[PDB]
Design a protein around this ligand. Sequence first.
Ligand SMILES: CCNC(=O)c1ccc(OCc2ccccn2)c(-c2cn(C)nn2)c1
Length: 111
Amino acid sequence: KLSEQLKHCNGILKELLSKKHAAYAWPFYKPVDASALGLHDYHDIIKHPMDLSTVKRKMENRDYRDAQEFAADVRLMFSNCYKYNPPDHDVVAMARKLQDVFEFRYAKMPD
Ligand SMILES: CCNC(=O)c1ccc(OCc2ccccn2)c(-c2cn(C)nn2)c1
């Protein structure tokens, strides 16, 4: 939502939030509510929380100046998941699948 590359980023963001990917994207829709989920060590392990609603707010507010800055937040969101959770947890399988969607479309960035 701005430059050509940021339009491509906004397109990816809309796809990640779309019903097409909802079966595995839903844990990433909103900030992790650590207290609600009983994850009382979450904010000791994850210094920089990130989620798709925060990425959406930042895109809407024209916070991202380029595609690289947008991608860094999306990857931070996945990295937090891989850091906090055992690699055999259901949420990690969901993260892997949504990251596959992200990486393959991000690679189609217009020059
Ligand atoms: C290391 C222990 N982890 C958790 O106890 C845990 C539980 C639910 C989560 O999210 C809701 C969710 C996801 C998938 C299936 C069912 N419920 C999470 C979680 C969510 N995110 C983004 N990262 N971890 C962790």
